[PDB]
Write a protein that binds this ligand. Sequence first.
Ligand code: NAG
Lengths: 50, 50
Amino acid sequence: YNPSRVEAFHRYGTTVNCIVEEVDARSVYPYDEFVLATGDFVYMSPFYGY
Amino acid sequence: QLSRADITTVSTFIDLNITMLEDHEFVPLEVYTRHEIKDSGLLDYTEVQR
Ligand SMILES: *[C@@H]1O[C@H](CO)[C@@H](O)[C@H](O)[C@H]1NC(C)=O
């Protein structure tokens, strides 16, 4: 989404697209953190819990 | 007339047993295939960028 056309004026148009994906996570010893298929690091052990 | 096997026979020769070396087949063996080594990395720049 972009703002409608108004002459000699700046306009701001916000777009929010919810996205959900199934990614393959990987982890290595000591398994204290894991990465995702998108290359994002997650600094939490995959087995962390209560 | 008596057969040749009717009299006891003693081997006058010094027997020497020779056992040829049996044929051996070598099968492929790798500790870590090239695919496993590539998969050892936590992240892959090719897959992440794709
Ligand atoms: C092999 O050699 C031995 C002597 O070392 C002999 O007594 C024997 O008859 C030979 N042959 C076989 C089939 O064992």
